Structures are given as C-alpha cells and as structure tokens.
Design a protein around this motif. Structure first.
Motif, PDB file in Angstrom:
ATOM      1  N   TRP A   1      51.222  10.290  73.372  1.00 58.12           N
ATOM      2  CA  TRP A   1      51.435  11.011  72.399  1.00 58.12           C
ATOM      3  C   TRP A   1      51.038  12.504  72.532  1.00 58.12           C
ATOM      4  CZ3 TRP A   1      47.586  11.787  67.601  1.00 58.12           C
ATOM      5  CH2 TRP A   1      48.076  12.846  66.758  1.00 58.12           C
ATOM      6  N   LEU A   2      49.750  12.696  72.969  1.00 56.96           N
ATOM      7  CA  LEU A   2      49.156  14.258  73.480  1.00 56.96           C
ATOM      8  C   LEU A   2      48.929  14.323  74.693  1.00 56.96           C
ATOM      9  CD1 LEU A   2      46.698  14.217  70.348  1.00 56.96           C
ATOM     10  CD2 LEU A   2      48.772  15.514  70.483  1.00 56.96           C
ATOM     11  N   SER A   3      49.219  13.236  75.749  1.00 58.73           N
ATOM     12  CA  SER A   3      48.974  12.933  76.990  1.00 58.73           C
ATOM     13  C   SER A   3      47.555  12.765  77.498  1.00 58.73           C
ATOM     14  CB  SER A   3      49.495  14.469  77.738  1.00 58.73           C
ATOM     15  OG  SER A   3      48.274  15.219  77.941  1.00 58.73           O
ATOM     16  N   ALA A   4      47.561  12.186  78.712  1.00 58.81           N
ATOM     17  CA  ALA A   4      46.258  11.498  79.195  1.00 58.81           C
ATOM     18  C   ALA A   4      45.422  12.690  79.593  1.00 58.81           C
ATOM     19  CB  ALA A   4      46.543  10.729  80.633  1.00 58.81           C
ATOM     20  N   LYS A   5      45.914  13.849  80.147  1.00 59.94           N
ATOM     21  CA  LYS A   5      45.183  14.901  80.291  1.00 59.94           C
ATOM     22  C   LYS A   5      44.571  15.377  79.098  1.00 59.94           C
ATOM     23  CE  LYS A   5      48.508  16.503  83.416  1.00 59.94           C
ATOM     24  NZ  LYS A   5      49.741  15.652  83.382  1.00 59.94           N
ATOM     25  N   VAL A   6      45.113  15.332  77.914  1.00 61.66           N
ATOM     26  CA  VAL A   6      44.290  15.752  76.663  1.00 61.66           C
ATOM     27  C   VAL A   6      43.143  14.916  76.390  1.00 61.66           C
ATOM     28  CG1 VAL A   6      44.818  16.136  74.242  1.00 61.66           C
ATOM     29  CG2 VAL A   6      46.162  17.367  75.677  1.00 61.66           C
ATOM     30  N   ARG A   7      43.526  13.733  76.471  1.00 59.52           N
ATOM     31  CA  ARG A   7      42.384  12.649  76.351  1.00 59.52           C
ATOM     32  C   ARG A   7      41.239  12.897  77.212  1.00 59.52           C
ATOM     33  NH1 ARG A   7      40.604   7.672  77.857  1.00 59.52           N
ATOM     34  NH2 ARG A   7      40.108   6.295  76.440  1.00 59.52           N
ATOM     35  N   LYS A   8      41.476  13.310  78.547  1.00 64.19           N
ATOM     36  CA  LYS A   8      40.419  13.602  79.362  1.00 64.19           C
ATOM     37  C   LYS A   8      39.561  14.624  79.023  1.00 64.19           C
ATOM     38  CE  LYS A   8      43.101  13.386  83.506  1.00 64.19           C
ATOM     39  NZ  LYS A   8      44.229  12.721  83.566  1.00 64.19           N
ATOM     40  N   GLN A   9      40.400  15.769  78.350  1.00 62.75           N
ATOM     41  CA  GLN A   9      39.702  17.120  78.000  1.00 62.75           C
ATOM     42  C   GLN A   9      38.715  16.730  77.007  1.00 62.75           C
ATOM     43  OE1 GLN A   9      42.943  19.515  77.669  1.00 62.75           O
ATOM     44  NE2 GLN A   9      43.192  20.066  79.805  1.00 62.75           N
ATOM     45  N   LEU A  10      39.246  15.997  76.141  1.00 58.67           N
ATOM     46  CA  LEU A  10      38.559  15.623  74.785  1.00 58.67           C
ATOM     47  C   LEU A  10      37.218  14.795  75.164  1.00 58.67           C
ATOM     48  CD1 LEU A  10      41.570  15.131  72.353  1.00 58.67           C
ATOM     49  CD2 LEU A  10      40.077  17.192  72.436  1.00 58.67           C
ATOM     50  N   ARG A  11      37.604  13.693  75.907  1.00 55.03           N
ATOM     51  CA  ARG A  11      36.563  12.897  76.130  1.00 55.03           C
ATOM     52  C   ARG A  11      35.397  13.551  76.969  1.00 55.03           C
ATOM     53  NH1 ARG A  11      35.987   7.533  76.177  1.00 55.03           N
ATOM     54  NH2 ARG A  11      35.135   7.722  78.381  1.00 55.03           N
ATOM     55  N   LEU A  12      35.504  14.967  77.496  1.00 54.91           N
ATOM     56  CA  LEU A  12      34.464  15.613  78.076  1.00 54.91           C
ATOM     57  C   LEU A  12      33.731  16.519  77.097  1.00 54.91           C
ATOM     58  CD1 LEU A  12      36.402  17.409  81.109  1.00 54.91           C
ATOM     59  CD2 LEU A  12      34.547  15.609  81.180  1.00 54.91           C
ATOM     60  N   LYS A  13      34.151  16.726  75.819  1.00 54.35           N
ATOM     61  CA  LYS A  13      33.232  17.357  74.979  1.00 54.35           C
ATOM     62  C   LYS A  13      32.102  16.362  74.610  1.00 54.35           C
ATOM     63  CE  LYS A  13      37.311  20.203  72.962  1.00 54.35           C
ATOM     64  NZ  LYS A  13      36.563  21.407  73.686  1.00 54.35           N
ATOM     65  N   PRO A  14      31.103  17.278  73.901  1.00 58.59           N
ATOM     66  CA  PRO A  14      30.084  16.124  73.410  1.00 58.59           C
ATOM     67  C   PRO A  14      30.512  15.148  72.250  1.00 58.59           C
ATOM     68  CG  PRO A  14      29.921  18.519  72.432  1.00 58.59           C
ATOM     69  CD  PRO A  14      31.101  18.571  73.419  1.00 58.59           C
ATOM     70  N   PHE A  15      29.581  14.265  71.896  1.00 59.74           N
ATOM     71  CA  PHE A  15      29.891  13.467  70.958  1.00 59.74           C
ATOM     72  C   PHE A  15      28.383  13.452  70.173  1.00 59.74           C
ATOM     73  CE2 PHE A  15      27.068   9.738  72.007  1.00 59.74           C
ATOM     74  CZ  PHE A  15      26.634   9.907  73.358  1.00 59.74           C
ATOM     75  N   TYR A  16      28.432  12.898  69.126  1.00 65.57           N
ATOM     76  CA  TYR A  16      27.558  12.915  67.850  1.00 65.57           C
ATOM     77  C   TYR A  16      26.831  11.587  67.462  1.00 65.57           C
ATOM     78  CZ  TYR A  16      28.627  17.606  68.371  1.00 65.57           C
ATOM     79  OH  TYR A  16      29.096  18.993  69.063  1.00 65.57           O
ATOM     80  N   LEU A  17      25.608  11.648  67.372  1.00 67.20           N
ATOM     81  CA  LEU A  17      24.980  10.640  66.652  1.00 67.20           C
ATOM     82  C   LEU A  17      24.492  10.799  65.179  1.00 67.20           C
ATOM     83  CD1 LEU A  17      23.581   9.880  70.061  1.00 67.20           C
ATOM     84  CD2 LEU A  17      24.133   7.909  68.753  1.00 67.20           C
ATOM     85  N   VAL A  18      24.587  10.311  64.186  1.00 69.00           N
ATOM     86  CA  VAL A  18      24.280  10.438  62.902  1.00 69.00           C
ATOM     87  C   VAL A  18      23.412   9.204  62.295  1.00 69.00           C
ATOM     88  CG1 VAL A  18      26.306  11.851  62.351  1.00 69.00           C
ATOM     89  CG2 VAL A  18      25.985   9.457  61.636  1.00 69.00           C
TER      90      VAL A  18
END
Ligand SMILES: Cc1ccc(-c2cc(C(=O)O)c3c(c2)ncn3CCCNS(C)(=O)=O)c(Cl)c1
Ligand SMILES: [Zn+2]
Length: 354
Positions: free
Chosen positions: A176-193
């Motif tokens: 859908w949005l491409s493997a490159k976009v998934r790689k860029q997004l998976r490089l952003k932080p993540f959060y724990l609530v």
C-alpha cells in the motif's frame, strides 16, 4: 452514496464547535504542561503530536478529546508480561547515573501505577486553580471542562529504540504505502502507556502497554499509494470520508443503544483499526475513487462485520493482540453489535436517515 454524501455534508456543519472546543482543551493542557515541568519527575514532559486536524488535540467523539504527554525516558529495557505481546515491564539498562524516575522503582522495574498516581496527583491540584474543570473516574486521566467537554490525558514514556519483536509483523503497509515508508515509520520512537493488563478479575498494576497512536496522522494525511493522492483535482479518493463515516456510524449506534449501554466497550479505536486493515487489503488508489463512496463504505462495514462475527480484530501494530478478545470485550457485546451492524448494512443504513 447520495445518502452518504449528505451525511458527510452535515458533519462539516459542526467544525466551529469542534475547533473552539479544541482551543478550550488546548488552554487547559498548556496550563497542566507548566506544572508538571516543575516536578523533577516530569520536567522532560511535553505534548505529543497525535492529531490529524488539530496538532495536540485528537478528537475521539463529538465532545471527547484525547491528549498525550510524552516523557523522554532513555536507556529503556523491556520484558514482556506473560505472552500478552502488548504489555511489558519496564527496566533500565544499567545505572549510568541514578535517573529522575527512580522514585517509581520497585526493584529493577518501573511501577506504572506509582508513576501514574503522582501524575494524577499533580494534575488534580492544578485543576482547582477561570474555566470550570473537574476530574472523572477510572490508562488515562480525564477532565470535564464547562461540564460539556471531556479530555483524556495519557502519560507516555518515549522510547527511541527498535520496536519490540511483537510488532515485527505489524504495520503491514508494504503493498500500500511501500516497504520504504514502513522502514521510515519503524524508525520513529514508540510509546509505553500505563494501561494495566487484565489478570483474573483484577489488574496487574505494573505493566505498560505499547502505543503507536502517533503514527495515525503520519498515515491518515499521507494515505495514498500515489504520493500526491488528494493534492490535486485528478486524485481524489474517499479514504478519509470512509473513516469519518465508520466513526459516525458507531457514534450514532452508541447513542441509540444508550438505554442498556450494550455498546459501552466499543470505541473509534476499533473503527480506525478495521479501517486501516481495509486499506491494507485494498492498496490501490483506484480502489478508493471518490465516485465509489458507496461501495467503499460497504467494504469497510463488511470487514467490520467480519471482525465482530469472528470476534477477531488484530491490533494494527501487533498481530497477536486481539482487540476483540473475550478478555477485553465480552461475547454478548460483540454478538449484539454484529446484529446491529448486519441490520444497518442490509437496510442501507437507516440510522443515517433524516
Ligand atoms: C495506521 C494506524 C496508526 C495508528 C493507529 C492507532 C494506534 C493507537 C495505539 O496503538 O495507541 C491508538 C489509535 C490509533 N487511537 C487510539 N489509540 C490508543 C490505543 C488504544 N488503547 S488505550 C486507549 O491506550 O487503552 C492505528 Cl489503529 C492505525
Ligand atoms: Zn487520497
């Protein structure tokens, strides 16, 4: 689709209300943001940008707003609670130097409940000191502004680490949005609530839930296979209109079954999640043409209906976490809403009538 174009036109009529209320929420939150920073525990606190129309203030329902307070927490280590895939104990790597959050330590791990209980304590003190805002009951802290506007305030730890392994197979945006976009997004932080897991008929008050809420705006407003989707008159899709219609359908359904509150446990989080799963199954922009609004809506409702009947709705980032499991939403409620939505779709959504 004529009926659905009408529904969407009516929803525009309440933008001012939404926008002035948001501004009301924005003030209060900035107030609270000042006090938390005086605290040695919460000085690295700040607002997380999670909104698609408003930057700091996400709209969860007509008078319900969601706001997140991120806190930068370095050198963080996770140990997954049982096999929940979404819930984790939080530790630190070593003692580089003894961190500010050490006050909420119990052994090596960080107490969701203890940190939350000081967060809640600070916010309530400031709540007294002119708009009339109070606190409500119950992962979040909740405000009632002017008795009409509800705000949910979520503390999140910010980890800039590699996402945990449970997410290895989530974010299935490749076709859908491409493997490159998934790689860029998976490089952003993540959060724990500090959402506590449900064990027995109580809670495990030291677990933290993984959170990717901040990814929604990244994809909602950059949502087409074509990078210029919805940036010109030749590339209009109805992806955002179907999401609005999906949410509105659940809002209206919850309003009518308010007597016996059967639909208490369902929220626009489920709707969003099934929506994006449908985006995964229908990756081409040609599959979301604006003149196909009717059929695209039926795609989304059908898939939602499938999730309800099979009692299965995967976390979009964690495929082994079932948002519709019986540990979370009982079987009578899911059965109920299958029946209501089955009806709505089979009779051309009379709940949208005038
Ligand atoms: C493509 C894409 C991007 C983001 C999301 C997304 C993620 C989360 C999350 O994982 O935090 C969301 C969310 C949307 N709306 C709310 N929440 C909070 C979690 C609910 N649980 S809670 C209240 O904390 O108890 C989705 Cl669905 C799809
Ligand atoms: Zn588009």
């Amino acid at each position: 689709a004529s009926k659905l174009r009408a529904v969407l036109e009516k929803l525009k009529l309440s933008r001012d209300d939404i926008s002035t209320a948001a501004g009301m929420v924005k003030g209060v939150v900035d107030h609270l943001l000042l006090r938390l920073k005086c605290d040695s525990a919460f000085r690295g606190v700040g607002l997380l940008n999670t909104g698609s129309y408003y930057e700091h203030v996400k709209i969860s329902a007509p008078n319900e707003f969601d706001v997140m307070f991120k806190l930068e927490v370095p050198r963080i280590q996770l140990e997954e609670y049982s096999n929940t895939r979404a819930y984790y104990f939080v530790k630190f790597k070593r003692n580089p130097k003894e961190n500010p959050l050490s006050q909420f330590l119990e052994g090596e791990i960080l107490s969701a409940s203890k940190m939350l209980s000081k967060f809640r304590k600070i916010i309530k003190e400031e709540i007294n000191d002119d708009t009339d805002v109070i606190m409500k009951r119950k992962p979040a802290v909740t405000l009632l502004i002017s008795e009409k506007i509800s705000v949910d305030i979520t503390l999140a730890l910010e980890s800039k680490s590699s996402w945990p392994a449970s997410t290895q197979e989530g974010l299935r945006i490749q076709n859908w949005l491409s493997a490159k976009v998934r790689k860029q997004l998976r490089l952003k932080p993540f959060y724990l609530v500090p959402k506590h897991a449900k064990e027995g008929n109580g809670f495990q008050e030291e677990t933290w839930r993984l959170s990717f809420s901040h990814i929604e705006k990244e994809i909602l407003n950059n949502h087409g296979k074509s990078k210029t989707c919805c940036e010109n008159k030749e590339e209009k899709c109805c992806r955002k209109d179907c999401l609005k219609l999906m949410k509105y359908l659940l809002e209206q359904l919850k309003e009518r079954f308010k007597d016996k509150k059967h639909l208490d446990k369902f929220s626009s989080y489920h709707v969003k999640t099934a929506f994006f799963h449908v985006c995964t199954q229908n990756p081409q922009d040609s599959q979301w043409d604006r003149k196909d609004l009717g059929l695209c809506f039926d795609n989304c409702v059908t898939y939602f209906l499938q999730c309800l009947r099979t009692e299965k709705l995967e976390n979009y980032f964690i495929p082994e976490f079932n948002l519709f499991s019986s540990n979370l939403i009982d079987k009578r409620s899911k059965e109920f809403l299958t029946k209501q939505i089955e009806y709505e779709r089979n009779n051309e959504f009379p709940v949208f009538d005038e």
